[PDB]
Design a protein around this ligand. Structure first.
Ligand SMILES: Nc1ncnc2c1ncn2[C@@H]1O[C@H](CSCC[C@H](N)C(=O)O)[C@@H](O)[C@H]1O
Lengths: 159, 159
């Protein structure tokens, strides 16, 4: 129903956490190369997963490959998840086909990518005043579960 | 505000993640001993933390020490994150003074602790069927940011 996309993810445990999370809320996961890690079976199993958990995972050679993929697939909206905007994750009206795009742990999303999208499709999780940024998988968790809430948790156990 | 409490946390990176998270949303963090790890200065620095992040952290000898601390301080409600209930994190009405209680990664909260609280104060995060459990930090993030949302993000940058 909606997808999650990591731009050049750097830290493996984060991507592990985000794979569990996508299974939990039923999102597909997009990893835009280059990655700071391999999905080697031995590291994947050490973190309590296996090859079947990596079915929702699609790799792309670069950002433009990722855009070409979405166009040739169906209707979509990209949301740029960044500290560098004024609009909250709760003020966006989410819908089937949306893509939540997240920046790398260190540099964050490139200015060009964020600027390619209108204000309405840029979203910041509120933070205490003396705070620089959330851990990547925490940001994905928060924004993913706000989108899912707005979609009435379509497809959840007992719901 | 509201607080977060970890019952016998076992895995260090999770608790590191959760200390950053408490600073980011301005919650106090309660660690109920025994822990599965030491908080040695060299591991704390390796995980990108300092004195200021560790001021938010209060340790308790056991569950009852944690309860004694809370009643010596004012009104409070404990909310337990558990799979053993029907109520979603969204369906609870959170309020200033509430405490979000989380079980150890490898064990979950003791039956007795969950049973000590009424149905309304037991909460589960929605899950798609037959999905691996969330990383503990992500579960804390989801429930913490729902409580914060209901409190209109009191105290966030520019509020
Ligand atoms: N408050 C917030 N709102 C929205 N997304 C956030 C966020 N905090 C982190 N993220 C997401 O998590 C990614 C990794 S954090 C990167 C920021 C970097 N440490 C810096 O100095 O700026 C971000 O690019 C963004 O997509």
């Amino acid at each position: 129903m909606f997808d999650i996309a990591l731009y050049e993810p750097e830290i493996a445990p984060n991507t592990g956490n985000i794979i569990r999370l996508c299974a939990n809320c039923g999102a597909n996961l997009h990893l835009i190369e280059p990655l700071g890690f391999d999905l080697e079976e031995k590291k994947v199993r050490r973190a309590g997963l296996d090859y079947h958990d990596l079915a929702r995972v699609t790799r792309h050679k670069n950002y433009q490959a990722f855009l070409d993929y979405l166009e040739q697939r169906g209707e979509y909206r990209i949301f740029a998840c960044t500290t560098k905007t004024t609009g909250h994750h709760v003020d966006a009206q989410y819908r089937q086909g949306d893509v939540l795009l997240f920046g790398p742990e260190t540099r964050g999303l490139p200015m060009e990518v964020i600027e390619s999208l209108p204000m309405s499709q840029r979203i910041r999780i509120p933070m205490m005043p003396d705070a620089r940024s959330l851990n990547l998988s925490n940001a994905v968790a928060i924004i993913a579960f706000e989108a899912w809430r707005q979609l009435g948790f379509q497809g959840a156990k007992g719901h």
